[PDB]
């Protein structure tokens, strides 16, 4: 196999002069103004982890002679790493938590509004604005609901009076026929002079 012995000062020296060159050129393709977000600064990171990949890959066919074999190599790449930056800015990260829990809470709030508010408004109306059943069911609750004798005897006496007239005229219709016959005979007897 191959075996390249290293000293911490060698590998860290190489790393630092690599960063020297990279700095030199990044300082030609752009002025010094730093802090740019997804641009410029993403490059810086990408180049860091790039050197991580390069040097880690290097330690595979190459060893160190200060501690046990290729141990700690990444700890010194990472110690020079920390020797740069990444101070977990407690204040911004605190802002992150505050606005993240605040985000959750406000979210839950708008949710329970989207439901609770319409449903309670309509509930209050549907409950009061149904008082038509005072009127309506008042209605449907109501819809289910659970000397002359003299005169009579007088017209009667008129009927009986007509009946009387009947019997009377019936008894007087023969008599007047007979007395008729008599008087017509007599009238024929005057012309004859009614003597002896």
């Amino acid at each position: 196999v191959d075996k390249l012995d290293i000293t911490q000062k060698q590998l860290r020296f190489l790393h630092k002069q690599f960063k020297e060159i990279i700095d030199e050129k990044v300082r030609t393709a752009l002025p010094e103004s730093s802090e740019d977000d997804q641009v410029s600064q993403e490059i810086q990171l990408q180049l860091d982890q790039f050197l991580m990949d390069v040097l880690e890959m290097a330690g595979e066919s190459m060893n160190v002679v200060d501690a046990g074999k290729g141990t700690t190599v990444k700890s010194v790449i990472q110690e020079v790493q920390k020797e740069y930056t990444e101070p977990f800015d407690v204040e911004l990260n605190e802002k992150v938590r505050k606005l993240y829990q605040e985000w959750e809470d406000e979210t839950v709030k708008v949710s329970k509004l989207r439901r609770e508010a319409p449903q309670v408004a309509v509930s209050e109306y549907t409950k009061q604005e149904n008082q038509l059943l005072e009127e309506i069911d008042s209605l449907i609750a109501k819809m289910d609901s659970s000397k002359t004798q003299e005169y009579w005897n007088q017209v009667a006496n008129q009927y009986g009076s007509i009946l009387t007239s009947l019997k009377e005229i019936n008894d007087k219709i023969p008599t007047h026929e007979s007395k008729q016959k008599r008087l017509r005979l007599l009238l024929d007897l005057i012309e004859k002079e009614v003597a002896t």
Binding site: V108, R115, P118, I136, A156, L163, I173
Partner: protein, 233 residues
């Protein structure tokens, strides 16, 4: 198009009542809390086991603590990264079909909407017609009361009037016209009045063969004045 994923996160953020990421974050923070408690508790509750007989092993434990710690921090962190990826992708994901079709809805949505103008105007309108029709039908009920009372009134009035006409005219009375049934044994009044009327007519002829008060009284006094006999045995 906004974003079908954003749409699923709004409908799910609303349904759930809490953001999906909140759940997975509770899972993570919880597990890692058990990782820290159990790390510094393995360390702590092992400090009493440092000495093994004579020499001291209190200098060879914190390397295991730190290393094992970082190892399972990264391992678990990534494993549950695949978890949350599975949760927010299969479990808590909605098919874009439904979101596009306008077919996905929530419990809130007994609701039905539209051109609010149409349903509000036609609603209020129709309801109002129904109300006035209610009033009309009620007043009409009152009319039904009127005609019920009229009905029964005519019931008693008619029944009494007719059982009267028959407890009176037919001579089938209770107080008055029982009299005798001889009068009514010739029940047709019409034929009777006709017969008596016409025979009376014939009589009126037999007299309207004139010679009236003057003709007869004068004929008489003439006769008598022509004298006769007086006296004989």
């Amino acid at each position: 198009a906004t974003t079908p994923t954003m749409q699923s996160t709004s409908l799910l953020t609303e349904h759930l009542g809490y953001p999906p990421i909140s759940l997975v974050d509770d899972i993570i923070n919880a597990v890692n809390e058990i990782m820290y408690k159990c790390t510094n508790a393995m360390e702590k509750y092992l400090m009493q086991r440092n000495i093994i007989g004579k020499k001291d092993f209190s200098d060879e434990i914190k390397i295991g603590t730190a290393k094992l710690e970082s190892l399972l921090e990264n391992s678990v962190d990534k494993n549950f990264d695949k978890l949350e990826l599975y949760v927010l992708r299969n479990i808590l994901s909605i098919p874009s079909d439904l979101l596009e079709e306008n077919r996905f809805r929530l419990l809130h949505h007994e609701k039905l909407v539209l051109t609010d103008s149409a349903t509000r105007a036609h609603t209020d309108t129709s309801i109002e017609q129904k109300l006035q029709e209610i009033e009309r039908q009620y007043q009409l009920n009152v009319m039904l009361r009127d005609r019920i009372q009229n009905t029964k009134e005519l019931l008693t009035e008619v029944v009494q009037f007719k059982k009267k006409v028959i407890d009176l005219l037919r001579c089938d009375d209770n107080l008055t016209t029982a009299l005798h049934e001889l009068w009514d044994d010739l029940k047709p009044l019409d034929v009777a009045v006709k017969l008596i009327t016409t025979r009376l007519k014939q009589i009126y002829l037999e007299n309207e063969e004139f010679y009236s008060i003057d003709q007869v009284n004068r004929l008489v006094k003439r006769y008598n004045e022509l004298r006769n006999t007086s006296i004989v045995r």
